[PDB]
Protein backbone atom coordinates (compact mmCIF):
# COMPACT_ATOMS: atom_id res chain seq x y z
CA UNK A 1 0.00 0.00 0.00
CA UNK A 2 2.78 2.50 0.85
CA UNK A 3 4.24 1.30 -2.41
CA UNK A 4 1.45 2.01 -4.21
CA UNK A 5 1.03 5.78 -2.58
CA UNK A 6 4.85 6.29 -3.54
CA UNK A 7 4.55 5.18 -7.41
CA UNK A 8 0.96 7.66 -7.09
CA UNK A 9 3.14 10.15 -6.18
CA UNK A 10 5.95 9.95 -8.88
CA UNK A 11 3.40 9.90 -11.68
CA UNK A 12 1.71 13.22 -10.07
CA UNK A 13 5.54 14.94 -9.79
CA UNK A 14 6.39 13.56 -12.97
CA UNK A 15 3.20 15.00 -14.89
CA UNK A 16 0.93 17.39 -12.86
CA UNK A 17 1.32 21.22 -13.48
CA UNK A 18 2.14 23.74 -10.87
CA UNK A 19 -1.37 25.54 -11.05
CA UNK A 20 -0.51 28.47 -8.84
CA UNK A 21 1.79 29.31 -11.31
CA UNK A 22 -0.52 29.13 -14.18
CA UNK A 23 -2.81 31.38 -12.14
CA UNK A 24 -0.80 34.39 -12.97
CA UNK A 25 0.44 33.22 -16.44
CA UNK A 26 -2.97 32.85 -17.22
CA UNK A 27 -3.75 36.37 -16.75
CA UNK A 28 -1.29 37.77 -18.31
CA UNK A 29 -1.48 35.51 -21.23
CA UNK A 30 -5.09 36.80 -21.26
CA UNK A 31 -3.95 41.07 -20.73
CA UNK A 32 -1.02 39.87 -23.87
CA UNK A 33 -3.88 38.47 -25.99
CA UNK A 34 -5.79 41.62 -25.53
CA UNK A 35 -2.47 43.90 -26.46
CA UNK A 36 -1.45 41.74 -29.37
CA UNK A 37 -5.07 42.32 -30.82
CA UNK A 38 -4.71 46.09 -30.49
CA UNK A 39 -1.69 46.32 -32.01
CA UNK A 40 -2.96 44.18 -34.84
CA UNK A 41 -5.83 46.85 -35.02
CA UNK A 42 -3.42 49.45 -35.24
CA UNK A 43 -1.60 47.83 -37.46
CA UNK A 44 -4.45 47.44 -40.16
CA UNK A 45 -4.78 51.35 -40.49
CA UNK A 46 -1.12 52.43 -41.27
CA UNK A 47 -1.58 51.75 -45.39
CA UNK A 48 -5.05 53.47 -45.59
CA UNK A 49 -3.14 56.99 -44.64
CA UNK A 50 -2.18 56.89 -48.27
CA UNK A 51 -5.87 57.95 -49.04
CA UNK A 52 -5.40 61.18 -46.93
CA UNK A 53 -2.97 62.19 -49.74
CA UNK A 54 -5.05 62.01 -52.70
CA UNK B 1 9.34 -4.15 34.82
CA UNK B 2 10.63 -1.11 36.15
CA UNK B 3 13.54 -0.57 33.98
CA UNK B 4 11.27 -1.14 30.95
CA UNK B 5 8.87 1.49 32.43
CA UNK B 6 12.08 3.32 31.95
CA UNK B 7 13.18 2.88 28.72
CA UNK B 8 9.61 3.33 27.39
CA UNK B 9 10.06 6.79 29.56
CA UNK B 10 12.92 7.61 27.78
CA UNK B 11 11.81 6.93 24.14
CA UNK B 12 8.73 8.80 24.37
CA UNK B 13 10.98 11.78 25.83
CA UNK B 14 13.25 11.48 23.12
CA UNK B 15 10.32 11.31 20.35
CA UNK B 16 7.26 12.45 21.81
CA UNK B 17 5.70 16.28 20.66
CA UNK B 18 4.61 18.69 22.43
CA UNK B 19 0.74 18.71 20.92
CA UNK B 20 -0.41 21.60 23.49
CA UNK B 21 2.45 23.77 21.26
CA UNK B 22 1.45 22.09 18.38
CA UNK B 23 -1.94 23.08 18.35
CA UNK B 24 -0.63 26.61 18.66
CA UNK B 25 1.60 26.48 16.05
CA UNK B 26 -1.14 24.94 13.71
CA UNK B 27 -3.67 27.23 14.35
CA UNK B 28 -1.11 29.55 13.42
CA UNK B 29 -0.05 28.15 10.07
CA UNK B 30 -3.69 27.67 9.44
CA UNK B 31 -3.48 31.65 9.15
CA UNK B 32 -0.55 31.98 7.27
CA UNK B 33 -1.43 29.52 4.55
CA UNK B 34 -4.38 31.82 3.71
CA UNK B 35 -2.54 35.34 4.30
CA UNK B 36 -0.51 33.77 1.79
CA UNK B 37 -2.86 32.36 -0.96
CA UNK B 38 -4.58 35.79 -0.62
CA UNK B 39 -1.04 37.42 -0.61
CA UNK B 40 -0.31 35.54 -3.92
CA UNK B 41 -3.75 36.45 -5.38
CA UNK B 42 -3.55 39.83 -4.84
CA UNK B 43 0.24 39.69 -6.56
CA UNK B 44 -1.30 37.41 -9.67
CA UNK B 45 -3.42 40.52 -11.05
CA UNK B 46 -0.70 43.73 -10.69
CA UNK B 47 0.50 43.66 -14.37
CA UNK B 48 -2.55 43.09 -15.70
CA UNK B 49 -3.12 47.03 -14.79
CA UNK B 50 -1.26 47.55 -17.57
CA UNK B 51 -4.42 47.10 -20.16
CA UNK B 52 -6.03 50.25 -18.45
CA UNK B 53 -2.74 52.52 -20.76
CA UNK B 54 -4.18 51.17 -23.74
Known sequence: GKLQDS????????????????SAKLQSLQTKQQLGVQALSIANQTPQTILSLF
Chains 1, 2 share one sequence.
Not at 7 to 22: C, M, P, S, T
Open 7 to 22: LDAGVGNLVDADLAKE
